[PDB]
Design a protein around this ligand. Structure first.
Ligand code: HEM
Ligand code: HEM
Ligand code: HEM
Ligand code: HEM
Length: 211
């Protein structure tokens, strides 16, 4: 299922709270890391040039940007800021086809209490899982548990430093890495439902910022 990427604009418009927490995460700042003389000591350890400008290097940008190599995604040729850094769609999926339902359903639910099955969103490409997406970026190195690893490889792996051992079940649970979770009224329900969804929502900060 391949809908085109559009970038963070509308997601952040309707989901300000999340986009507000997100803009502080490392993912949000991903392209910064590629600039010269930035994150120099970690670059040297991975044998990368701390003074080189990697921001247009095709062996790097694919993982610090939204949907590189995909319909509607980031291109080096013509950078689009709404698609730079790993944004909403890098985890939630290209949303050209599913945000449409986020609007309609929101209104249906507000007007008459109606709810929509996640199945419709998953059919239109929304991601409720999200491990394969993270893996393409984090476990793209020979010897990792992810099949289909091919150059360009993630230069930061356990061999460089143990902090880089990626464990989805632990890492999806770090709001400083993903983003803070806020309370849903539950306009969407049912399968495919994320395995930690009820847990995240059980402890979410109260909603805020309109709809
Ligand atoms: C291309 C040669 C390239 C560069 C340059 C680059 C740099 C870079 C930096 C400076 C970091 C931060 C490291 C730190 O410890 O602070 C970083 C982090 C990650 N990268 Fe990267 N990166 C380049 C290329 C790639 C490619 C091709 C991928 C995906 C296959 C990729 C992925 C990642 C991931 C994942 C991280 C996070 C590591 C972690 O904290 O677990 N990078 N990159
Ligand atoms: C981009 C700025 C972005 C938006 C917008 C966004 C929104 C969003 C919402 C509304 C939820 C549900 C409610 C909540 O606050 O928990 C949600 C949930 C998850 N997100 Fe997200 N999200 C954006 C970006 C990202 C990125 C880049 C990642 C991955 C690093 C990510 C991950 C997650 C995860 C995991 C959840 C939980 C899913 C669930 O409980 O069903 N989001 N996001
Ligand atoms: C999928 C839900 C997913 C998870 C989980 C995840 C986690 C994660 C962590 C914990 C970090 C470290 C953050 C920190 O130290 O503060 C991290 C860092 C990067 N990630 Fe990631 N990540 C997930 C998904 C993805 C995807 C799909 C990509 C590639 C488009 C990606 C890339 C990166 C990069 C790059 C970093 C480093 C940021 C920087 O300092 O440059 N992640 N991720
Ligand atoms: C942009 C492509 C975009 C993303 C990404 C996104 C994500 C998202 C998630 C993860 C949820 C939660 C679904 C679940 O319960 O598993 C969610 C929910 C709602 N969204 Fe959204 N959303 C994106 C875009 C938009 C846009 C542009 C709007 C507004 C026109 C919008 C609206 C909503 C509404 C309403 C919900 C339901 C809230 C509730 O409390 O149940 N989204 N979105």
């Amino acid at each position: 299922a391949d809908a085109p990427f559009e970038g963070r604009k509308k997601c952040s418009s309707c989901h300000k709270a999340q986009a507000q927490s997100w803009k502080d995460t490392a993912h949000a700042k991903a392209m910064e890391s590629l600039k010269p003389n930035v994150k120099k000591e970690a670059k040297q350890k991975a044998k990368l040039d701390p003074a080189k400008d990697y921001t247009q290097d095709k062996d790097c940008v694919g993982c610090h940007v939204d949907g590189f190599g995909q319909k509607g995604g980031y291109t080096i040729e013509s950078p689009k800021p709404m698609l730079t850094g790993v944004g909403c769609e890098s985890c939630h999926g290209p949303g050209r086809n599913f945000r449409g339902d986020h609007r309609k359903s929101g209104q249906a639910f507000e007007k008459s209490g109606k709810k929509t099955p996640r199945k419709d969103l998953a059919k239109k490409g929304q991601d409720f899982h999200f491990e394969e997406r993270c893996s393409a970026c984090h476990l793209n190195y020979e010897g990792s548990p992810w099949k289909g690893a091919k150059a360009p490889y993630t230069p930061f792996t356990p061999e460089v430093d143990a902090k880089y051992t990626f464990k989805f079940d632990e890492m999806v649970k770090e709001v400083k890495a993903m983003h803070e979770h806020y309370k849903l009224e539950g306009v969407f329900e049912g399968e495919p439902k994320f395995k930690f969804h009820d847990e995240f929502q059980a402890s979410a900060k109260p909603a805020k910022k309109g709809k």
